[PDB]
Structure formats: C-alpha cells, structure tokens
Write a protein that binds this ligand. Structure first.
Ligand SMILES: [O-]
Ligand SMILES: [Zn+2]
Ligand SMILES: [Zn+2]
Length: 229
C-alpha cells in the first residue's frame, strides 16, 4: 500500500489523512523511522510533525505539492526533539505558520531545534487554550502531562477514528518505551492514560515509531510506563 517518494514513505490512513515517514541511520538503532501526519481540510493542508531533517521535510512538502497541490496552512509539532522539529527551517522557508506547545518553544534552543513561530497554551484540563490555536480545522490538540518529554502534546483528528500520540505512545507489541533521555518517569504512565481518556472514540492510534495500532497501544505503553516508577 505504501507510496515511496524519494527516501520517505507516505500511507493513506483515512479519507483526507496520510502518515509521513522519514528515516535516520543511527548505529545502535538501525535506520529509525519517525511518523507524522498530513491532513487535507477542504482547500488547505495541515501538517503534524516535521521529519528528522530540513531536506526530508522539504520532501514532505514536495509530496504534498504533487499529491494534493493545496497550500499548507499550518504545521503543529509535538515536542522539541529532532524527529518532530528537525525540519522547522524547511517549513519556515516555505512560508508555513508553525505552532508548538509554549514549553516546546522554550526548550527548543537547548534541544538544538528552531522554535515554532507561535506558541500553544493549555487549559487546566489539558485542552489547548482556543486563542492560541487559530485555524486548526479538525486538529484537536491535547496536553496529556509530562511523559516521553515534559512538553509532549497529542492530536486528535475530528471526523475520523484517529488520534496521534507522537512519541508518548508505543505499539501494543513494543518491548520498551524507546528514547527515555528526557522522560518524566514518575508521570509517564498517567500521561499515557490521559491521552487515551481525551480521545475515547479513537480506534486508530498513530504514533511516531510504530505503525498505527489499536487502543491496546495505549494500555501497553502505560503498563511499560508503570515499571519506570
Ligand atoms: O523523539
Ligand atoms: Zn522525543
Ligand atoms: Zn521520537
């Protein structure tokens, strides 16, 4: 099913929703896939997450030009690590307005990333403060608490069965929680469960480093996270 386009892979998940996948060759971990999303909302496109690098992110935009040929109205990036924010300059060179958690933008420089141009803030229940998320279309942005990182956010796609956990969530057969270098080991389990609770009807869980899975990804991730505390 998957479309190969240069060194990236694109898979349609639902009407109007595609998964983008990019790779980085890192001894110790093989060629590491990272996934994000592309959403068509009528006459515009929305992107969730960059690729690892600026060049790869430019290739995402080239795939969008070829396959959709509509403007990319905005991108939201789900925390300040390179698999999610490595390509910010490519977005900015393309004139795309970029959004991230306020805390991601503050952490971006120390993580070697370029901040998004706009900051999202969150209400006490975890839902994005509306004034900070203009024109988000079907993207429903939720801060579940600290986990994979302090700043990690998640995104549901209204009108679909899809919720994106980014690097917070691992698939139901995952043998570890992957990169824990910036993790909050105390709060991870709860944050994973809060993601699930925010998007109860989402039966397709999309994530950064596994193929899409059932909601067993959420329960399994949270059980792996229980053991870090
Ligand atoms: O990451
Ligand atoms: Zn990360
Ligand atoms: Zn990651």
């Amino acid at each position: 099913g998957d479309q190969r386009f240069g060194d990236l892979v694109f898979r349609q998940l639902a009407p109007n929703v595609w998964q983008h996948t990019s790779y980085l060759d890192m001894p110790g971990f093989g060629a590491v896939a990272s996934n994000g999303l592309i959403v068509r909302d009528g006459g515009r496109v929305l992107v969730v997450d960059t690729a690892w690098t600026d060049d790869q992110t430019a290739q995402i935009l080239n795939w969008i030009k070829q396959e959709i040929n509509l403007p990319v109205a905005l991108a939201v990036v789900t925390h300040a690590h390179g698999d999610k924010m490595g390509g910010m300059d490519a977005l900015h060179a393309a004139g795309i307005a970029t959004y991230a958690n306020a805390l991601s933008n503050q952490l971006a420089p120390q993580e070697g990333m370029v901040a998004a141009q706009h900051s999202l803030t969150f209400a006490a229940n975890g839902w994005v403060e509306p004034a900070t998320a203009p024109n988000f279309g079907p993207l429903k942005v939720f801060y579940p608490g600290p986990g994979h990182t302090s700043d990690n956010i998640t995104v549901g796609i209204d009108g679909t069965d899809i919720a994106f956990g980014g690097c917070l969530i691992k698939d139901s057969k995952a043998k570890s929680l992957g990169n824990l270098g910036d993790a909050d080991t105390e709060h991870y389990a709860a944050s994973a469960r809060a993601f699930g609770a925010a998007f109860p009807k989402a039966s397709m869980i999309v994530m950064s480093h596994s193929a899409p899975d059932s909601r067993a990804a959420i329960t399994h991730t949270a059980r792996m996270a229980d053991k870090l505390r």
